[PDB]
């Protein structure tokens, strides 16, 4: 029954779209740039998802200007205003760590048809 | 089930797995065996979970049991009598009785047997 659940559920966040590792999403993250608000979109591949309830975190990896970038976000973080799932990937693993060594043609992911 | 907190029983993990499998086979084939108390203590959850698999008798569960028992006559008995016998009992299929110590090394012996009350 996960004793801390009654504390957890108060801060739990609904409306989170369902997604799995391998899907391609763009995360709308609000940032601070000289005390003004703007949303910076991070589009990449979800390579892992470590379930913990409120402490559930997912990682998104993107290739930008020839340098790989990985960002880990708490799923229920208020800093994430909205998550949009673009494509559904076809993978055989729960964590895609093997993608850290692949570039371009070899790093593509099958699409669930 | 829960792995042993300390070092393994037979001196290695593979020997411990083989030891547990053989002890479970002997217990199912005879109905009660006598062994050192820690061996029966570790054997209880293993045999009880095998009996739980045998209770819900399907081909999948039969394969699950056979991947640990390796003895086909014992598997047949387990899925023919031992399984249906404990149909309406929820847990506690076995019991442990502590008996007199061994003479050679003063090891604490214990007898583990299946319950036949109901």
């Amino acid at each position: 029954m996960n004793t801390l659940d009654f504390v957890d559920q108060a801060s739990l966040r609904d409306d989170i779209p369902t997604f799995s590792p391998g899907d391609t999403v763009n995360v709308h993250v609000k940032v601070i740039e000289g005390s003004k608000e703007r949303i910076q979109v991070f589009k990449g591949v979800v390579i892992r998802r470590q379930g913990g309830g409120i402490s559930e975190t997912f990682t998104v990896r993107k290739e930008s200007y020839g340098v790989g970038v990985e960002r880990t976000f708490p799923v229920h973080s208020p800093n994430i205003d909205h998550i949009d799932v673009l494509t559904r990937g076809d993978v055989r693993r729960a964590k895609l760590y093997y993608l850290r060594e692949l570039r371009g043609k070899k790093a593509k992911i099958k699409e669930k048809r | 089930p829960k792995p042993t907190k300390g070092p393994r029983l037979g001196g290695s993990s593979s020997h411990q797995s083989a030891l547990l499998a053989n002890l479970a086979t002997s217990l199912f084939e005879h109905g009660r065996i006598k062994t050192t108390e820690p061996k029966a203590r570790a054997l209880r959850p293993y045999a009880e979970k095998l009996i739980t698999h045998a209770k819900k008798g399907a081909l999948h569960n039969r394969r699950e049991v056979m991947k640990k028992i390796r003895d086909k006559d014992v598997v047949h008995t387990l899925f023919a009598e031992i399984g249906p016998f404990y149909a309406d009992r929820n847990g506690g299929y076995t019991r442990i009785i502590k008996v007199e110590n061994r003479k050679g090394d003063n090891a604490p012996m214990a007898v583990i047997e299946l319950v036949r009350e109901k």
Partner: protein, 214 residues
Amino acid sequence: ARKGILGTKLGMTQVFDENNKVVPVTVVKAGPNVVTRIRTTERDGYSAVQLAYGEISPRKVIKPVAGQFAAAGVNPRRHVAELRLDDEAAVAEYEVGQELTAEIFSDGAYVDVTGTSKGKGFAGTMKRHGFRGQGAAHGAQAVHRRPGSIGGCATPGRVFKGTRMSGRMGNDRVTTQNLKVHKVDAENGVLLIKGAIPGRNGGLVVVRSAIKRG
């Protein structure tokens, strides 16, 4: 003056503040406490208040403790502890039978949590005292973790009481200071304390107002 309460460490979780920062918070079951005895200078020589916490079946208490609780006038509780105050005016607001709950603390308050640290067993110097071990190669012979030198060359020819070597570790009362109470859940009687408090989950802790930042 310095408020206090007996509680239980439930676990640790995560919360987000109003700046969207993450706050690792420890959940403390600051349940109902009942004052059982009052220590006064005129009778005991010092001023303190005694609190009772926990629930146990009445057949589990021995006759002396049950008699003490009956003389106090309340049902027996599992845990009994004393809060050392400073003077009689501090103890004037507590009377026997009064029930203390979590809402004595407020959001943003600074507290001191006291508990028994986790047990680590017979721990060597590398773990107990942070000793740096010797080299793991270059010919070092069976000294990869031993402390090395102890004393020196005769003179005192002894070992100078207080020398740090291996021994039992943990299981000691530990106080963590200036912990900020992030939220006081009154309806569960639960304190959300930012940080880590000593002890295992389900252990007994004492939450007191901070002595430095309060």
